Amino acid sequence: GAMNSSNYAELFNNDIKLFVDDTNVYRVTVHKTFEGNVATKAINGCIFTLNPKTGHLFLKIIHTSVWAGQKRLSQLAKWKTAEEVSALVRSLPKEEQPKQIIVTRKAMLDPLEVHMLDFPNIAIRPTELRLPFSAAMSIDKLSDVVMKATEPQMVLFNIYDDWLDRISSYTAFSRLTLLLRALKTNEESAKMILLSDPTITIKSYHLWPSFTDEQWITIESQMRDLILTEYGRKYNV
Template identity: 60%
Template sequence: MKVIHRSVRAGQKRLGQLAKWKTAEEVATLVRSLPVEEQPKQIIVTRKCMLEVHVSFQACLKIDKFSLKATEPQMVLYNIYDDWLKSISSYTAFSHLVLIPRASHVNNEKAKMLLKPDKAMVTEPHHIWAINL
């Protein structure tokens, strides 16, 4: 996820076009910076249902691990699926990834209660979510 502080886009017009250009630049930079064996074989880009994904990623900024890092422009790389792909399909993981932040967008307090670990459950430092699917 690329966190862009609001000061970067201050005074800019055509923010939609700027976002597309910046996204393309950042994806290209990220892919080129990875070792060859870690570079993705395929990148899926979609405009369909973008509002749904946009709302979900806005809600992601309410998650402490993300919002605490959003103090300045920087590239932050997370495996946002945690270890989900070991037990569920990539389609199901993506569906959960859309639903969980949407729940946070609808009712942040209830979503935090569902995602907040109890005393017995520890969120690993490299994980985002307290739940394990």
């Protein structure tokens, strides 16, 4: 069934599972035409497929050529997502295949179920959490590889950098969701927080800055301030 606050520690047990977020698969800019009509122009997108226990991110880059000559792109985007996730699962060794796939939007359930009929023992689940994975394209290195792609491409990341050497998966996921929530609520301020002190750098093989344990506590505090504030600036409170 659905994943929510009550079964949250299930994410960090030893059954392999993947979140799939499709909110950045089909991306467009809306513009005026010479005749004063409106048109869309697609830009490269990505499927965000994340193991929340290990941090492994399977980022399938969706090149705009996949949309050429196709109709009803927002519907096709769900099926393309399901096709790519199914291809990913089949590419993994049996012992690496997930036992559950959790979709961040319920409209992915039927496309994924149909593409995974071959895998009757993989549970496809929705969630009641409002997870901030749409903000993945606010991570500079992820945005950069999506925008530069000239063809379909899969790129593997660990979205936790080396955090698991010092903290548990539960704590790492909590930090990740706090960072992404902040970036989603106010990208400019969130990014100012992360990069203000130039002495803290992002390693070449990492996505986030190399904060000490004490600096992460300060950082996390500043992100919660931001989220509560914007919640004021937004509701006037």
